[PDB]
Every structure is written in structure tokens, then in C-alpha cells.
Amino acid sequence: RPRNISREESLQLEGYKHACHALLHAPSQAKLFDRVPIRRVLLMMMRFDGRLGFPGGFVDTRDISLEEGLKRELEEELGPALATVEVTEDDYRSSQVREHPQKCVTHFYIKELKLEEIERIEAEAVNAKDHGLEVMGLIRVPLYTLRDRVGGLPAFLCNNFIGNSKSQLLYALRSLKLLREDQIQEVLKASHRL
Amino acid sequence: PRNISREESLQLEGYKHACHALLHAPSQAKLFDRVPIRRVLLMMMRFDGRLGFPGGFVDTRDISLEEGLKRELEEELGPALATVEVTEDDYRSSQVREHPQKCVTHFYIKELKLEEIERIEAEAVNAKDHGLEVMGLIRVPLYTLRDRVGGLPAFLCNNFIGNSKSQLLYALRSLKLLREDQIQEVLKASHR
Numbered sequence: 001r002p003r004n005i006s007r008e009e010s011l012q013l014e015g016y017k018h019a020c021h022a023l024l025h026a027p028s029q030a031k032l033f034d035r036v037p038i039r040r041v042l043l044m045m046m047r048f049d050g051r052l053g054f055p056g057g058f059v060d061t062r063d064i065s066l067e068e069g070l071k072r073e074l075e076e077e078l079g080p081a082l083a084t085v086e087v088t089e090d091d092y093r094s095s096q097v098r099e100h101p102q103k104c105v106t107h108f109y110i111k112e113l114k115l116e117e118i119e120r121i122e123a124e125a126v127n128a129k130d131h132g133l134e135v136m137g138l139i140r141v142p143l144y145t146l147r148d149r150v151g152g153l154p155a156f157l158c159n160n161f162i163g164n165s166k167s168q169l170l171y172a173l174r175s176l177k178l179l180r181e182d183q184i185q186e187v188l189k190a191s192h193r194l
Numbered sequence: 195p196r197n198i199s200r201e202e203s204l205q206l207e208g209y210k211h212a213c214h215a216l217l218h219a220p221s222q223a224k225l226f227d228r229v230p231i232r233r234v235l236l237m238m239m240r241f242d243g244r245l246g247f248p249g250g251f252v253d254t255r256d257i258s259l260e261e262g263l264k265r266e267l268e269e270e271l272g273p274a275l276a277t278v279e280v281t282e283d284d285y286r287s288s289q290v291r292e293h294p295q296k297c298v299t300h301f302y303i304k305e306l307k308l309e310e311i312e313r314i315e316a317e318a319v320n321a322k323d324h325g326l327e328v329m330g331l332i333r334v335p336l337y338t339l340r341d342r343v344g345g346l347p348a349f350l351c352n353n354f355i356g357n358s359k360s361q362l363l364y365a366l367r368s369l370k371l372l373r374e375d376q377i378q379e380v381l382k383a384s385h386r
């Protein structure tokens with residue numbers, strides 16, 4: 001149902017509800033089992049509704065800017081550590097629009113941090129206003145495929161994702177150059193053997 | 195997957211052993227000041243992309259099923275755990291499979307104080323296994339939302355390792371959190 005739309009065009013519409021979500025990420029030299037390289041830490045979360053999503057939430061664009069709304073949502077959900085860390089217009093990536101079930105536009109941001117910054121974010125998430133309520137926990141996204149050819153990313157893609165968050169994740173994998181187009185197809189295939 | 199006994203368990207030959215625990219605490223918190231959380235139940239995202247309970251393998255002949263579990267927990271949840279009891283009284287059940295080379299997993303349910311769960315979550319990011327075997331802790335939503343889908347039923351549509359779903363369901367019956375009919379209602383809501 002979701003369709004692409006430019007930021008600028010989408011900011012012009014009327015009586016549309018807006019949401020902002022961010023992928024925070026950082027490179028890692030860690031190797032799982034000292035063999036399988038982690039490569040990069042991507043944060044997602046388990047939401048109060050039983051589903052996985054990226055942090056963020058609604059913004060009222062007549063009151064505050066998209067970035068200001070995003071900063072506030074992250075503070076609630078991810079905690080104090082998000083202060084001084086500034087997701088800006090540069091971090092903006094894409095906008096999608098729908099009408100079923102509600103007139104609704106979601107914006108997706110992608111921001112690289114230093115590893116210790118992600119770690120400090122994890123360490124302090126348990127202190128967020130939303131911890132154990134709207135946010136049920138923070139999780140890192142496995143980017144590897146294991147030898148059984150299912151465990152890791154393919155298996156993880158069989159989890160339950162809110163809205164278009166799965167599709168956003170896949171976008172980021174292709175944009176941060178982490179997987180080739182075919183690799184993504186391979187991942188969706190290995191996943192879909194239910 | 196077939197239910198078995200502790201009695202037998204330790205005596206079978208050629209099987210690999212695994213221990214897992216549900217740590218849980220009561221809670222007075224209300225989501226949107228409306229929906230009661232009731233209880234906090236810990237699970238995790240594994241390195242394999244699946245949800246499960248903390249723990250792992252333990253050499254049967256080396257030390258007791260508790261000694262293996264308590265080590266596994268400390269390794270996966272962090273230092274805080276060295277002061278968790280995890281006695282025999284916390285033992286719960288043992289299922290036996292013949293899939294990925296004959297497994298036997300034992301399930302443990304143990305009640306803690308909310309503070310204790312909170313301090314565990316707070317130190318989990320320090321566990322030897324953080325960012326490796328354990329990719330993050332999560333609380334299990336026990337409520338069902340107004341849409342009659344979000345909350346627990348949606349949660350059960352996630353990808354679960356081994357029989358950690360069976361185990362979770364058992365806990366909800368065992369801990370008197372849900373009746374059999376109510377469990378049967380979330381499953382139908384979920385698998386729809």
C-alpha cells in the first residue's frame with residue numbers, strides 16, 4: 001500500500017499524520033564465535049505491541065519540525081544518552097505515504113554513530129521514559145547468515161514487523177552497501193521457507 | 195519434541211543437554227495508564243535472529259543442571275546473576291527431540307523482585323555474551339490490545355527457537371497469567 005514520495009512534496013499535504021523513525025548504526029570489528037564478523041551494529045526495538053520497529057513516532061509538523069519531533073521521540077524511547085547526538089536533515093533518507101487505513105506519512109532517517117555511542121545508547125535505554133512500557137527492549141540486527149543458511153538475517157526477517165519497518169531495514173542494507181541486490185533476494189528466499 | 199522426565203533425562207546416552215530459564219517479577223505499571231503490565235517476563239533476541247530464553251548447553255557429566263544453568267545465565271545476563279538462586283525448586287520440565295542430533299532441553303521458571311529484573315536489564319549490556327550470542331533482552335507483552343491483536347498475540351507471531359514458544363505458553367498457564375481458553379484465544383488471534 002505504501003508509496004514513495006519526496007520530503008518536500010509530502011510536507012505540503014494536508015490533514016496527513018506524520019511519523020519519523022531512525023536507524024542508528026555503528027561499525028564493529030567483533031566476530032561472533034570469533035569466526036563470523038558482526039560488521040555493523042543496527043538498533044531496532046521490540047514495541048509494546050509485540051512487533052519489531054525502528055525508534056521514533058508521530059510529529060505534529062505545524063508545531064515542531066520533523067527533526068525536532070524525531071529528537072523528542074528518540075529521547076523518550078532511547079533515553080538521556082540521545083542528548084547532544086543530533087539527527088539532522090542530512091540524516092533524512094526517504095518518505096512514504098498511504099491512505100488505507102489512515103492518511104499517513106512515514107519518514108525514515110539513517111545515522112552513523114561511533115560504536116561506544118551505540119553502546120552508551122544501549123546501556124542507557126533501560127533508563128528511558130518508555131522502557132518497559134512503549135519500548136519492551138532494544139535489539140541488534142544480525143547481518144550475517146549462518147551455515148545452516150537460515151540462522152541470522154534470514155531467520156530474523158521472519159519476525160513480526162510494524163508497518164513498513166521491514167522494508168525500511170531492507171532499504172538500509174542496500175543503501176549502506178551491506179548486501180548486494182542478489183544477497184537480499186537470497187536472504188528473502190531463505191527466510192520464506194516457512 | 196516430546197515431554198520427558200528429569201528422572202530419566204540425566205541417564206539417556208548420546209543426547210546433548212540445554213538449560214533455559216524464564217526470570218520474571220510482578221509489576222504495577224500501566225501502559226498508557228490503562229493497560230496493566232501485570233508481570234515482567236524476560237526473553238531475548240538470539241544471534242540466530244530468533245527469540246528464546248537465556249541459558250544454553252551444559253556438559254551433563256561435569257556439574258548439576260543448576261550449575262550449568264547458573265553459569266549460562268551469568269555468561270548471558272551478566273554479573274548480577276551470581277547471586278540468583280536457581281534451585282531444583284525452580285526446575286519445571288524437560289522436553290526431548292531427535293531433530294538437530296537428539297536434544298534434551300530443561301525449562302526453569304524463577305520469580306524475582308522487580309528491582310532485580312531491572313538491575314539485570316541494566317547490566318545485561320555488560321554480559322560476556324552481549325552483542326554476540328545475546329542481541330538484546332526483551333519483556334513479553336502479556337496484555338492484548340483493543341484491536342484484539344497487538345500485544346501478546348502479535349508477539350507470538352515472532353520467530354521462536356526450539357520449543358521456547360511451547361515453554362512460554364506453559365509459563366502463562368503455570369503462573370496463572372492466562373487460562374487455557376484465553377491461551378487458545380490469543381493463538382487463534384495470532385495465527386490469523
Ligand SMILES: [Mn+2]
Pocket residue numbers: 053054055056057077
Ligand atoms: Mn516508536
Ligand SMILES: [Mn+2]
Pocket residue numbers: 056057058073076077134
Ligand atoms: Mn514514541
Ligand SMILES: [Mn+2]
Pocket residue numbers: 076130134
Ligand atoms: Mn511517549
Ligand SMILES: [Mn+2]
Pocket residue numbers: 249250266269270327
Ligand atoms: Mn553460553
